[PDB]
Design a protein around this nucleic acid. Structure first.
Lengths: 236, 236
DNA sequence: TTGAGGCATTAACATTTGTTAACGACGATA
DNA sequence: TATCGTCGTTAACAAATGTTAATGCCTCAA
């Protein structure tokens, strides 16, 4: 991304250098809140939360470049108790204290409307996901995530559309759609395969019937068409 | 309250006078997609979406002062095809064509951080609402949506916390929670009355054991503490 | 006064999803 | 080569929710 690269070197010009993280690491966590601004530049991460009884919940994924904030700008108070876990083999993110971003960004606007728009991307994405997940129950919740992972981690192949993901177990899908037991998620997929909407090939899932997932996740498909038109056009 | 007070003037001091709306009026709709930046000053509205199937979905509610984006501040394209229906007897707001917001907000950067912070309040809200609705299915969805209603529009009476709202018909909560048929939402609420949680008096809902809702809407309760603490304190 | 329409409640029944358990396939370790 | 643990399936039963229909309470309009 062009804007993300211009922002990259705008930080290094002010003493902000990249930290390196490895898989299973938490850049921040729900238990020791620090209000930072994370400019995830490279790597795949997931924003999670754990209930008081230990229930895991994957709220979404983040693929660099992108911006995540654990606290508000003006008040600098916590925005919420979440964990940003690194699921890729290794990730590179510029961690900057929230206090400094104010002054850094008051002296330059073109980088402000960049971080602002990523936030607009965040909002629209959250509502679209909430829209498709709340209507068709859990069936559509699985279908929704599979549509997101296809539009971001997918690519055309002869067998079907491959999803370039590792450590994508059954529980990880359930965590990302509200299912708690790995047997319920496998039961929904058993029929998605019997309806040949998807298929399993070694190390990955393959999507054959994209239009099926679209019906059970229209607003999400719409969001990719409106927010990430690049990735969207590569699958139609 | 105050950060939006000096904001309201900063708009009409540059040629943005307020337009007025009445009940059931749509400020922006999904079929006519036009990118504005609405600043709901006074009144209550609901952001809705209508599926090709004809299904209605209430994504959330908006109570002034607040900011609602219909397009991206850069590309000027629609963040999504939604409808902002006025459900109050009387609502005032300030519309800005999104192309005009850029200039208006690039010179005064104190009101820039204001709009940016409300965007963050939106993000956390969506992430929190998505967390609690996903764990406990529909039973929890109603407990969550209810909790939201008692903090924003709930005042204390000897009979409990009264949700001062018109309507709130069974179908309307179904749209907010994600249930299609009104008979089902009634089923759950018929149990919450038996469960000494809520009662229906004077054509309004009175909450008596909001802690029961906190257990089923933990992330949402945490959101009011960190984002709108004044609201949180009114009931704690 | 009667009669129409909407909202709330319940029923019953179908469908989905929650929950636990058992089986097998695979890898890893000694 | 045997054994332990992880994960993917399926079974079986329980709970929740989807779906439709019927009944009652209320307002409204003639």
């Amino acid at each position: 991304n062009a804007q993300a690269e211009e922002f990259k070197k705008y930080l290094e010009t002010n003493g902000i250098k990249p930290k390196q993280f490895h898989k299973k690491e938490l850049i921040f966590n729900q238990w020791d809140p620090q209000e930072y601004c994370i400019f995830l530049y490279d790597g795949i991460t997931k924003l999670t939360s754990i209930s008081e009884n230990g229930t895991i919940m994957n709220l979404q994924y983040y693929k660099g470049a992108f911006v995540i904030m654990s606290g508000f700008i003006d008040t600098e108070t916590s925005v919420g108790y979440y964990n940003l876990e690194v699921i890729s083999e290794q990730a590179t993110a510029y961690v900057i204290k929230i206090n400094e971003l104010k002054e850094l960004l008051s002296k330059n606007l073109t980088h402000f409307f960049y971080v602002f728009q990523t936030l607009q991307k965040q909002v629209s994405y959250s509502l679209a996901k909430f829209n498709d997940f709340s209507i068709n129950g859990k069936h559509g919740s699985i279908c929704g995530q599979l549509l997101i992972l296809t539009y971001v981690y997918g690519k055309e192949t002869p067998d079907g559309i491959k999803i370039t993901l590792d450590n994508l177990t059954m529980q990880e899908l359930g965590y990302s759609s509200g299912i708690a037991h790995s047997s319920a998620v496998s039961r929904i997929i058993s029929k998605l395969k019997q309806e040949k909407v998807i298929v399993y090939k070694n190390s990955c899932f393959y999507v054959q019937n994209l239009d099926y997932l679209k019906r059970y996740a229209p607003k999400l498909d719409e969001w990719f068409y409106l927010a990430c038109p690049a990735t969207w056009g590569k699958l139609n």
